[PDB]
Amino acid sequence: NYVIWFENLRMTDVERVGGKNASLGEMISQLTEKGVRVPGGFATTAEAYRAFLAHNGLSERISAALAKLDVEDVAELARVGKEIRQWILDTPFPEQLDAEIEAAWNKMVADAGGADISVAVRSSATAFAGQQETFLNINGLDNVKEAMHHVFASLYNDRAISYRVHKGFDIVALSAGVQRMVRSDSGASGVMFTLDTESGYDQVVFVTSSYGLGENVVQGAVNPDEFYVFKPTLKAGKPAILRKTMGSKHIKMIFTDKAEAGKSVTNVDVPEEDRNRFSITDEEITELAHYALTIEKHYGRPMDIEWGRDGLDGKLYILQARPETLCEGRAQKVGQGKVRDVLVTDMTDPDWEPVMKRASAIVTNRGGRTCHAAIIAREPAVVGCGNATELLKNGQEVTVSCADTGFIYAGLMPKAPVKVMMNVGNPELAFSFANLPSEGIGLARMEFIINRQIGIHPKALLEFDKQDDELKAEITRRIAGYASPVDFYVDKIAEGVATLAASVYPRKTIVRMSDFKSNEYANLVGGNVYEPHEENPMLGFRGAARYVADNFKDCFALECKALKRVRDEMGLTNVEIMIPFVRTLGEAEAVVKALKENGLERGKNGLRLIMMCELPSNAVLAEQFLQYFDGFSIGSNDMTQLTLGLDRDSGLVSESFDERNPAVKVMLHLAISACRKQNKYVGICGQGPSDHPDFAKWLVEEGIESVSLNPDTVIETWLYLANEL
DSSP states (O other): OOEEEGGGOOGGGHHHHHHHHHHHHHHHHHHGGGTOOOOOEEEEOHHHHHHHHTGGGHHHHHHHHHHSOOTTSHHHHHHHHHHHHHHHHTSOOOHHHHHHHHHHHHHHHHHTSSOOOOEEEEEEEOOOOSOSOEEEEEOSHHHHHHHHHHHHHHTTOHHHHHHHHHHOOOOOOEEEEEEEOOOTTSSEEEEEESSOTTTOOOSEEEEEEEESOTHHHHHTSSOOEEEEEEHHHHHTTSOOEEEEEOOOOOEEEEEOSOOSSSTTEEEEEOOHHHHTSOSSOHHHHHHHHHHHHHHHHHHTSOEEEEEEEOTTTOOEEEEEEEEOOOOBOBOOOOOOBOBOOEEEESOOOGGGSHHHHTOSEEEESSOOTTOHHHHHTTOOEEEOOTTHHHHSOSSOOEEOOOOOOOBOEEOOOOOOSSEEEEEEOOGGGHHHHHSSOOSEEEEEOSHHIIIIIIOBOHHHHHTGGGSOHHHHHHHHHHTTTSSSHHHHHHHHHHHHHHHHHHHHTTSEEEEEOOOOOHHHHHTSBTOGGGSOOOSOGGGSSOTHHHHHOTTTHHHHHHHHHHHHHHHHTSOOTTEEEEEOOOOSHHHHHHHHHHHHHTTOOTTGGGOOEEEEEOSHHHHHTHHHHHTTSSEEEEEHHHHHHHHHTOOTTOTTTGGGOOTTSHHHHHHHHHHHHHHHTTTOEEEEESSHHHHOHHHHHHHHHHTOOEEEEOGGGHHHHHHHHHHHO
């Protein structure tokens, strides 16, 4: 009645032991047979806490103090809070609670065969983050009891007294969970989410990991390794890790031999070995992602989960699991209104709850997550702007974004006649566009992955051994966590492309192979020596000619190895491969021969092959080029430049650039007709349809199958076109 074992708790015991302990029992009792390993222990109950607090009778003394106390007088609140906490600290456990803890402790050491076990003593409130309060590596009975005293006192931490007065409430209790320690002090640990927190995208599992006890990743005291795993392909048993980001992993929490009270754990530097390694293996990331899903399937909602790899066992444990739910400040949701209605002020009392109702947004100088105004806006909301009173003006006219640095500008689906698809380059933004209404990605560009995730010329990696001490050293630095220089290149392209394809899966993602000019390959590390200066880069060594050049075929092979893995192993079959700058029919033919050499063929595993139609020759021999491909994506930028003989970046001529020049239109017509008479895909890329609505009109009238737009131009164009139909 005072102490309950986790194995006898269920999620229906939340009022008795709190959400954390109830959830622990729910997993132990229901999921251990589904493979989830949760450490054992016991919870104290809400009536244990009440009995404890009745003493002489402390409960009513606390209640008296809290009565006459302004929580928004920050002195009194610190003074009264400290006072209350010392009373709880100086109050002894009732005789029955001590005996019952002792008997439960004695059974734990009996279950552990021997033994000098250690435990976590955590706070499980009948109600965050947490400020919570937790104790780790607590080795004997009296330590455990004193760590429990502290947990009990934590209910009346100052912010907790506020948080409750703010949520508008007495007069409360909590439960202490006493759980066996997993030895991740010599292993690794972290936190998993069964959605992407940033975007909200729920088809992915997020796994963060570092060395040591997981308290550090939970608290953000360390920058951890971050991994994304794709749910559908993980369930089919295919390799499902989309993205690996190495954390700096500066420090790690370990055990002390020297445990006075909270000195049982300490932070220590991570060696440079471990720092530039990934802290868990692919097999582990995957194994954890499976646990995440069986937990989420069971609870029927998004989950936030703590886990640890025991450095003794080797085995992965789930430790805790719970449900997951100009000017600047702390930030989901956008909003609009006049700045006064967007309310701009220092910080709200509760007296600011009527006039708060008389308004439509809140932006405040002070505050963090559990700020007064930040809670009213959850039940929105930019807090923690040092000076918005200053920056923002009393007039108007603003709109307040949270799609988590909470900006504040400075501003303010029907049937479509074509398919509106996205033009996407940055895989770090991919899950934020999963959400946007589109028909997929009609141009997934490769150049951000190469510039920004890889950063090194593939021939420098291919010929690593011919460098350059200074360069061998730079490459090795950059390729940390990957098996070899060439494996880095393939792996990172696979990650980037799998990520983009996963974002809109199962929807079409047309991946353009690399469209770099040689001056862009020259800027990569190790690149200049392979990329001589050209007089006219727009017209130089790039595209198909580069892919099939003897001098560069081993690099093309690398990019092909990545795409093939993405489709053939990762099961991301929604990927089509687009080939740019195909100048002649001999090049078209050479490229399909090259792809074939590298295991990629039309019809094999459903592969579809698209040509970027961007040279005038592609238009006047449309039908002839089209035999080699399943369709065209028209690159109107390059088509316009070559038809009209212009560099649109040169200001001296570029006023004559116009995708809707009659000469360019003849070219588009030739291409789009050729495709139509073969019942073949024809799309167009470029912002022309967005920037010139009549061009969009002309394109629908020509029979274009799709249009590919920057995500932030997608809704407007869709609506314009739908309204026209």
